Design an enzyme around this catalytic site. Structure first.
Site, mmCIF file in Angstrom:
data_model
loop_
_atom_site.group_PDB
_atom_site.id
_atom_site.type_symbol
_atom_site.label_atom_id
_atom_site.label_comp_id
_atom_site.label_asym_id
_atom_site.label_seq_id
_atom_site.Cartn_x
_atom_site.Cartn_y
_atom_site.Cartn_z
ATOM 1 N N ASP A 1 -11.904 54.149 -28.890
ATOM 2 C CA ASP A 1 -11.104 55.392 -29.787
ATOM 3 C C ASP A 1 -10.644 56.510 -29.359
ATOM 4 O O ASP A 1 -10.604 57.581 -29.305
ATOM 5 C CB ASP A 1 -11.671 55.682 -31.244
ATOM 6 C CG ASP A 1 -12.751 55.639 -31.511
ATOM 7 O OD1 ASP A 1 -13.412 56.057 -30.052
ATOM 8 O OD2 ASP A 1 -13.016 56.118 -32.738
ATOM 9 N N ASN B 1 -16.739 52.835 -28.496
ATOM 10 C CA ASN B 1 -15.519 51.666 -29.211
ATOM 11 C C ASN B 1 -14.255 51.294 -29.204
ATOM 12 O O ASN B 1 -13.132 51.344 -29.265
ATOM 13 C CB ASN B 1 -15.826 51.818 -30.361
ATOM 14 C CG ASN B 1 -15.361 52.521 -30.663
ATOM 15 O OD1 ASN B 1 -14.741 53.739 -30.470
ATOM 16 N ND2 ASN B 1 -15.197 52.613 -32.615
ATOM 17 N N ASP C 1 -24.289 76.788 -40.084
ATOM 18 C CA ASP C 1 -23.581 78.280 -38.920
ATOM 19 C C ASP C 1 -22.704 79.006 -40.055
ATOM 20 O O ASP C 1 -22.772 79.081 -40.986
ATOM 21 C CB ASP C 1 -22.417 76.739 -39.128
ATOM 22 C CG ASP C 1 -20.596 77.319 -39.046
ATOM 23 O OD1 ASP C 1 -21.050 77.062 -37.208
ATOM 24 O OD2 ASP C 1 -20.022 77.255 -39.409
ATOM 25 N N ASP D 1 -18.666 58.109 -25.879
ATOM 26 C CA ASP D 1 -17.961 57.105 -26.797
ATOM 27 C C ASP D 1 -18.047 54.351 -26.813
ATOM 28 O O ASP D 1 -18.272 54.820 -25.378
ATOM 29 C CB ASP D 1 -16.443 56.630 -26.650
ATOM 30 C CG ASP D 1 -15.472 56.163 -27.371
ATOM 31 O OD1 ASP D 1 -15.634 54.938 -28.721
ATOM 32 O OD2 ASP D 1 -14.166 56.302 -27.074
ATOM 33 N N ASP E 1 -19.882 58.309 -30.196
ATOM 34 C CA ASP E 1 -19.777 58.600 -31.731
ATOM 35 C C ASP E 1 -21.823 58.738 -31.874
ATOM 36 O O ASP E 1 -22.063 58.125 -30.299
ATOM 37 C CB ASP E 1 -19.373 57.469 -32.075
ATOM 38 C CG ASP E 1 -19.772 56.355 -30.676
ATOM 39 O OD1 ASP E 1 -20.676 55.783 -30.691
ATOM 40 O OD2 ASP E 1 -18.606 55.640 -30.205
ATOM 41 N N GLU F 1 -27.163 80.762 -36.742
ATOM 42 C CA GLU F 1 -26.339 81.371 -35.654
ATOM 43 C C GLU F 1 -25.808 82.779 -36.312
ATOM 44 O O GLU F 1 -25.234 82.463 -37.682
ATOM 45 C CB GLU F 1 -24.634 79.887 -35.435
ATOM 46 C CG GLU F 1 -23.380 80.950 -35.074
ATOM 47 C CD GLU F 1 -22.332 80.756 -35.458
ATOM 48 O OE1 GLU F 1 -21.988 79.830 -36.412
ATOM 49 O OE2 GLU F 1 -21.272 81.101 -34.278
#
Ligand SMILES: [Ca+2]
Length: 554
Positions: free
Chosen positions: A23, A21, A197, A19, A27, A251
């Site tokens: 929060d 920033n 997926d 991270d 990211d 997958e």
């Protein structure tokens, strides 16, 4: 042999990687800032989990717009910059492709649900209920029925996964065309790989008959038996992947192992590589939340079977961990404080000497472990809420029974934040992390591992160099020396007249190993937890608890 057969991949779960920033959520800028870390480990290619616009009922796997990036991860310019920084370093990006289902907030779905007659009605599966209830007995992975009623039309829509994840209808030609155009949008930007997926569930069974009682206890497998599955995969290849140079990996969750060659035989023009789940689920009960004790004999026999289905024209991935499973060292090794480092190195050795393309899951290079969950409120996992719905509310199990058992199997064990250093919240964030950091970050963190030549990280780095320098260790043949042995795992890799022996003690006690008659140690490439290499010419080895080694023989 293509670049992807000899590459070492790393899987990044961006939500939990870095991270930048405050929060509490990882990211793109965070991933971009850590590219030197991954380059220095020796990674050739990264697979990122879904990075598209999403309401996050299932952390990116519920996508509401396929052509926009997730707001929490950054902007399209941040994605473009990630791509540009990877390329500078000679690294490749594999993205996650989630087209068995979309978000219920996708505009296709908002249109589809509005009436019976609209141009998007058949983008999804809408069906009348039977005898007062759902269209059939299909269960959802995430709790309750796979059918959800919509009072606007009085019909039910299909969701194998969450209620907020309606299945896309691959029987509808306009829908297939929209998926292919979307894939081109990303491939035109230069992505080098795509990971699909639940790729085995795309084709639904005509008529939706009830599952039998047998099928009901293994529904994941019935959902892989759609009659048009290979027709759709071949059409996708012809209309999309044939026009690019990207590698594809599926997958293949729930499929019987004998069907896997249909997806990956290179002559079939479907997918390039398989992710299979026979090994990672080898000790999981059918209900997916209990565990059944297994031995190394079971582990190695499963590997041998999976290797055989690749044959001459197919190719396997190899992995011991991903975002849907508990931590490798906790699951396959021994995460107690005295054995955690020994057993995590042993598992590194296994991972990096298998026949196939290895995927290292973020944090396993540090020997990260399962999380000490204390109450059910400590789980984010919607799969856990589903087990609560299916097992606790129905009176089949108590909350304490669910807790005890899912603490060992929950995918949230893999999702706790990456442990960068011993600053607040392991250096993952300056704010409050979306999921709690494991308290053992004070002893398990990247900063301390990189600085120690004897660490788990250094062992991974050294193994990756060796593998890169030794072609037998990626593309060589594979032969298990004795599949019945439940103590010591041993196998050879050979190519072009060169043979390498791998020997891994899976017991926390000393053990001996006798080489096949005629075989002798020629050179030791590397060992973990060993006080002395063998002598050139050795016909046997004495192993410390959890010792591993790679040897050139003859
Ligand atoms: Ca952030």
């Amino acid at each position: 042999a293509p670049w992807w057969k000899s590459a070492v991949f790393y899987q990044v779960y961006p939500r939990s990687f870095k991270d930048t920033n405050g929060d509490g959520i990882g990211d793109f800028k965070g991933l971009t800032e850590k590219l030197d870390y991954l380059k220095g480990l020796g990674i050739d290619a990264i697979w990122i989990n879904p990075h598209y616009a999403s309401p996050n009922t299932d952390n990116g796997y519920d996508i509401s717009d396929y052509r926009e990036v997730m707001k929490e991860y950054g902007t399209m310019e941040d994605f473009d910059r990630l791509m540009a920084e990877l390329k500078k370093r000679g690294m490749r990006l594999m993205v996650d492709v989630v087209i068995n289902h979309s978000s219920d907030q996708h505009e296709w779905f908002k249109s589809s649900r509005a009436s019976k007659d609209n141009p998007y009605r058949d983008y999804y599966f809408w069906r009348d209920g039977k005898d007062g209830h759902e269209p059939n007995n299909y269960p959802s992975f995430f709790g309750g029925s796979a059918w959800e009623k919509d009072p606007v039309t009085g019909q039910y829509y299909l969701h194998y996964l969450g209620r907020q994840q309606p299945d896309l209808n691959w029987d509808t030609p306009k829908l297939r065309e929209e998926l292919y155009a979307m894939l081109r949008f990303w491939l035109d930007k230069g992505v080098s790989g795509m990971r699909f997926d639940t790729v085995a569930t795309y084709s639904k069974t005509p008529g939706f008959p009830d599952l039998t009682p047998e099928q009901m206890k293994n529904f994941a497998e019935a959902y892989t038996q759609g009659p048009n599955l290979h027709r759709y995969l071949q059409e996708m290849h012809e209309k999309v992947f044939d026009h690019y140079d990207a590698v594809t990996a599926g997958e293949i969750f729930g499929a019987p192992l004998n069907q896997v060659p249909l997806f990956i035989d290179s002559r079939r023009k479907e997918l390039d590589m398989a992710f299979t789940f026979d090994l990672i689920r080898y000790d999981r009960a059918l209900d997916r939340w209990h565990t059944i004790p297994r031995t190394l004999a079971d582990f190695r026999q499963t590997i041998d079977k999976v290797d055989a289905i690749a044959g001459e024209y197919g190719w396997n991935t190899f992995f011991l961990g991903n975002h849907d499973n508990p931590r490798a060292v906790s699951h396959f090794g021994d995460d107690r404080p005295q054995w955690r480092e020994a057993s995590a190195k042993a598992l590194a050795t296994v991972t990096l000497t298998q026949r196939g393309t290895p995927f290292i899951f973020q944090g396993d290079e540090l020997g990260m472990t399962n999380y000490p969950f204390k109450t059910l409120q400590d789980f984010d996992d919607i799969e856990v809420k589903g087990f609560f719905q299916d097992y606790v509310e129905t009176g089949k199990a108590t909350a304490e029974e669910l807790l005890t058992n899912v603490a060992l199997t929950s995918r949230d064990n893999a999702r706790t934040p990456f442990q960068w250093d011993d600053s607040a919240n392991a250096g993952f964030t300056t704010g409050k992390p979306w999921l709690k950091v494991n308290p053992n970050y004070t002893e398990i963190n990247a900063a301390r591992e990189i600085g120690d030549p004897k660490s788990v990280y250094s062992f991974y780095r050294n193994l990756i160099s060796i593998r890169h320098e030794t072609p037998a260790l990626s593309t060589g043949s594979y032969r298990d020396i004795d599949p019945s042995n439940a103590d010591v795992y041993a196998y050879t890799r050979s190519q072009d007249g060169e043979t390498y022996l791998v020997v891994v003690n899976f017991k926390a006690e000393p053990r001996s190993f006798t080489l096949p008659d005629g075989m002798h140690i020629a050179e030791t490439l590397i060992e973990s937890s060993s006080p002395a290499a063998p002598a050139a010419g050795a016909a046997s080895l004495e192993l410390q608890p959890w010792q591993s080694g790679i040897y050139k023989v003859k």
